[PDB]
Symmetry: T
């Protein structure tokens, strides 16, 4: 088999690459399911109450799809892969399925689901940062970038649900 | 002069005078919509109506382009717009989208917008039915317009009621 | 009681079975979503000097199929339908068989075969939708026709690679 | 092996004669290619102060007809057909009569007559294709309809110049 | 409560009659909206080889006058006025006479005469607004001045076509 | 001795008190700078589902007012004036009262009231500058008029939100 | 022909022949500036003059556009440019901006630039005074130009002396 | 009419009738190339031919622009294109770039492309030699075209053989 | 009150968030005052000596305004705010007021003030980096980005005052 | 010291008379500057419905000739020459006769004649420069050739308008 | 001499700046030689085998030239410089000269050279990251960015030589 | 045996020594590469208030010379030549002397002298290539002429800075 120096420099640090890839896959799986589940959640932000909220949920959805594309590349660079079956992907997702709630006509119910998904993502990508910190500059940078946007996403929904200031 | 773009329609047994008459009435409604939606958008005020303005604005501008689009086709078919602007108002396929009395309730404005769009859907669907399998040019343009009226209705349905649609 | 939806009424007047249409739309649109996932993996494994040029053709199909998902999803909700609540449901009701990475994937022709079969299924799937909406539902027909148009192109791409059959660019 | 082409199968199921369709497509597309050549010459000879403003209208038609050629050529190969081997064959099978420079070309109305007759032939030609593919072949219909749409516009341009007949811009 | 509108107060302090100003603005803005309709028809009928180059000049005026309508309508509502409830009312209160298609429209000079008279009326109309707002209402003056500026250009275009009078481009 | 500044001489010939003008300009421009700061905080606290849509309107005003600061600052130096040496001086000489975050800011109407009052002060402030420069200083008048024009729009935005009063977009 | 854009000015008691005469002389100076600033910019050489070239270049190009701008207006008012280019030079509102003798000192070039701009300020200010409250079109264009001449003077004042201005 | 753009060439002792005749034959080859390269590109199929299509496409589109470019010049010199499109085919400077019999081997297609480009190089080089030192306009355009034919040959040489060239 | 997971992940590290926000506010305050004071400093880079220097001071001014916008967002994400009064902001600024010097007609006097402001900013943002290093990826990244531009700004003015090479 | 200018040395080695070349360049470039002035007037007077479409062709020539002036002026200074101190000197040394507005300018053919004669002079003028720099001065040749190229186009435009002679677009 | 605070903050950390600059110069020298040597290597990726490979080698070449431009700036900011002579630069390069191989007509021979150059770059920039980690935010960020692209470059050539998945 | 290269054959027919040409091209192109390196260092040391404005002129030359390297390198391979195997070879065969940082670099005139001498060498170098290819090799001549054209401009820039000699912008 071939010498992969991009991997060797990580192994020298004592980094467990199988464990890292496994965490990346679960985190990345959650991004893909988010892209699906946030589609439905955005659709159901209806009425005059929910109208302005759609574009905030839309932004999060599209940015999370790009988080999937971003970290997928890295998984393969490290010698890992995505699950063969899409159902496997759903089952190993780092996060709980962001289902449409029962009383979805109250947009706060939708916002709670979005908020919980984002909070899970924050914990998930923060764990990846802690592992790659001081060992894997490439993975750390990508994971830090993603984490940075999840923090923003949580801040958006916190501002809508509660009266908590954040951004724009 | 020989107009072959018309001859190919006549061969299909399409009544062109009747078609143009329908096109003019449908196109006239697009022009009045451009005027009336201006006033309806202006009065979507307050914190309730603020986000609604841009949705009404999008419909208004798209409907003006529907007028531009089908006006070209009317003249290609040998027809024309009414000589007087008041005639145009009178032959409009749709009822006048007047500002309602309790306009400070934005739902009243949304009701008027919704009714205007629903009329447009029925209007352009009729044109599609006549041109279907006979007039590819007019069908395509009418279909395109109808497609956007469906979207417009869906927007206002989502606002008035809690009914999902688009973006 | 429930709102009047005239965009749906004009379809019902034609005798169109809207529940049956929406069902077909959901299954077709579900296949576009799974394509987006499965083509990702298929594209990743078009490796070596043989597979290098093939990646961007598979990429083009993947990205266009994701936009097919976005496009028809909007229409499904306009018709009063919805996507499955669970992502696993979506996978299961898909109109097409799962485009799994083949066993001998290092032969790029094996991957091309899987891509081709997926596209061929999509052609049949969207053609059925066109036949139902033809002369009844202008909006759904136009969107389904547009999608079908690109699936035909996608098939043609992979036919040109697998066999020596001329198509496009 | 001879490959399964599902984009063709779905057409055959409708009872569409594909050999006859491709033959019509080739003759129509040939006329587009000759238009691109002949309209070059016709445009060149729209001279003087009378013909100056007419050049750009003939130019627009020329370039749009060249894109019609490019558009439908792709579709011909997707259907398993091809362009004629020889360029002279193409000229001979053209759906339309050759748009030759008239004898009294210094009268710009003589040139406009030739342009108009060429467009009128194209309208009839692409309308036939629409009638054949209508309800059977969504892809070919859509493309042919798009082209027909522009030929109708082109005829309208020249009708407005020759006679005083309103149209577009 | 009835709100304090300081953008209006600063005008009242100058001794400006706001009801009279708004009335003039509405009549002037109404003429812009009717122009957009009537110039459509006038442009359509600038046919033949004589009228071909004239279409785009009439087009430019039409589109610019539609933007004049949009521009001043905003200002009317800022001043606490509104457009007429009915579109027929708008037509009736228009500052200018209806720009009807003339009888011998096949002579493009007949159309140019109508265009010119409409522009000349607009110049007088917007010049009056400038005189009223001059030294009192900077916002309305600036907008009216901008519009007047383009009406002067429009008149100059048609004067150059009808007569041999130099102007612009 | 000191350079001849003809851009200033033409103003002095009109009898314009340049020291007094520059003073008014500095105080007006100081208010634009503090607006940029204070609107930042006000925008940040337009939270919840009530305040979400209001943020971008407050944002637009903030950014436009910062450009008003940039615009008139250039002019102040052209007239031989300058900004205060200390940033605390600037705050104190501001033409307008500090747009502090209100106590019950969680009611977005409280924030809107503060925004409205700031804009109303700016309208009065720039209108005074227009009155002084009117018929004497074309450059300062034009810039002050432009700014005033946008403050009128800003007021209209917040009037439409607080009360149901129609304006713009 | 009836020219209503002119009639509205005559009603104000504006002397149009006198106005056009001033406009032509002012516009002529803009044309000569375009020529003379070319030569002045070329000779802003050395390490001293290197940064100065682009400031002189900006003025030159803006002044050429002033010529284009007001030339249109002259013809709208029924006037015209001089038949001969030498006439234009002679009726210029400003003295010829000749390359000075000790041009290798860039301050000499800056002095010539500054004097030309100062003349332009006085020239266009006079036009503003005449058209003020009578001719909105000519006033607006003249005001716009004057505005840029003020900026141009400020640029050269900042270079020659230590006087702050802009960017 | 006096055509001075032609007179300046005649003074150089340039045979303009002979030049135009060569230009027409060279330009005719560009037009046929646009047709024939279409078919050649279509048949660069399989995994072997996939990357080759875009290189053949680039040549095809550039050669069509060569036709547009020199066609203008032919008319400036008082010449014209053949009345019949079949005449154009017959007077082409180059042999017809027919699809070869064993086209499924992409090297067969590349051979045809290469031969067509090599003919074009010789064709436009001849035009450069005639116009060299006499006709700056025609020389410049011919030189430009020749420059791209050299590049086209280099592309196909790199594909057929292992010969380095460009990108 | 609401659960803010973007904050919780920082608290787990042992990061003092009140102390961090306090440092961010003082640093961010200095960026805002820079935007004001560099306006005046740029205006007074006059003559043929100062002409080319204006655009370098302009670039720093505009980039520092964006540093204010950037870190302000983050302050609110962390549950902090800007001072209620603008005068408070000036008083808590991390840096000394970049006043116009007395002999400003010598452009070197202006450059000295600009240089001292930038040097203060370097120390200020470096302190923030040291605190957030290995605990707060989002704040660290933003502070590192800003620091990176302050280093460039100092290098610009060092190249003008002294003959010290840097960049472009 | 007097500096070594190698860009000039390489020309002197060819036996090129640089003083004579610069003199020709100045006279040719002077004609471009006067063209920019005179073509302004000529364009203004292409009025009526006859002259309307002709304006933009005269406009294109005017603007392109102004860029010819800018282009070759740079080269004159690179060769160690300069433009005349006085603008009147420039007019007098112009390679071409002054393109004055003709007496019967209301006939647009009279204007076209003047334009044509000016272009024909420019062709002869720049062709001379090409002949001198040919095989000696690559930079001056290339620039002169580029200009000549556009003058040939300009002559072709006016020949097509005056007479019925084909050319371009 | 002048106070350079951008350097002082590094010295406080205990960072050896002479040693760091020396490593930066050798790393940066390798980027410059890469720009030259990859030109030749790309030229010789000929035939129908090598055609698609040219653009991948082109991308690496151009990105490595930008790595040279990027880190050169930083070298001067730290008070270092490039070698006076270009031949010195070649001799101190961190990497072995990426010469055209003897059997270059086999594109795999070229790919091996490209791969070895990229693997050397990975080790080189990873060393810089390890030194600047937790001491020099600016240098670390730039070196991390470069490393990130070298990892991608290695992954490209690994995918071509062997059948190893990576990116696009 | 070896492929027929017609782009080379047409040159050989002219009697052009291609081996000698390629050799000159390589040495000229090598100097463009070393310029890119050496100008980097020279630009870096144009410090202080004296050198600030000079940096961007040196930058422009550096970047343009790197593109000269890219441009002619392509041509060298088209002619069947190649770049030196070792980068040290390239440095040694360079047509120009190494543009080293001078000892008293803190005087920007010392740096300008080095830049000027490098450009002057490039002018002579590319002029020689033009003389050889003149009337034989249109492609190489055109590229070499273009490069020469920019070296003349580069020299003119540095002549204007070092001495007071007018040039361009
Ligand atoms: Fe998220
Ligand atoms: Fe609508
Ligand atoms: Fe597909
Ligand atoms: Fe056509
Ligand atoms: Fe008008
Ligand atoms: Fe404001
Ligand atoms: Fe000026
Ligand atoms: Fe070719
Ligand atoms: Fe800073
Ligand atoms: Fe000319
Ligand atoms: Fe690399
Ligand atoms: Fe150079
Ligand atoms: Zn995410
Ligand atoms: Zn509509
Ligand atoms: Zn699809
Ligand atoms: Zn066509
Ligand atoms: Zn108007
Ligand atoms: Zn403001
Ligand atoms: Zn001026
Ligand atoms: Zn060609
Ligand atoms: Zn900062
Ligand atoms: Zn010219
Ligand atoms: Zn690198
Ligand atoms: Zn060079």
């Amino acid at each position: 088999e071939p010498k992969v120096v991009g991997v060797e420099i990580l192994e020298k640090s004592g980094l467990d690459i199988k464990k890292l890839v496994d965490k990346l896959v679960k985190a990345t799986a959650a991004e893909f399911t988010t892209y699906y589940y946030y589609t439905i959640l955005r659709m159901h932000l209806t009425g005059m109450e929910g109208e302005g909220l759609k574009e905030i949920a839309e932004d999060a959805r599209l940015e999370d799809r790009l988080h999937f594309e971003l970290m997928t590349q890295r998984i393969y660079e490290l010698g890992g892969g995505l699950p063969r079956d899409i159902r496997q992907l759903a089952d190993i997702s780092a996060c709980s399925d962001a289902y449409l709630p029962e009383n979805w006509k109250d947009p706060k119910e939708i916002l709670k689901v979005l908020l919980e998904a984002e909070q899970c993502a924050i914990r998930t990508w923060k764990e990846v940062c802690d592992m790659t910190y001081g060992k894997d500059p490439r993975t750390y940078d990508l994971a830090q970038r993603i984490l940075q946007e999840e923090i923003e996403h949580e801040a958006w929904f916190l501002e809508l649900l509660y009266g908590r200031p954040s951004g724009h």
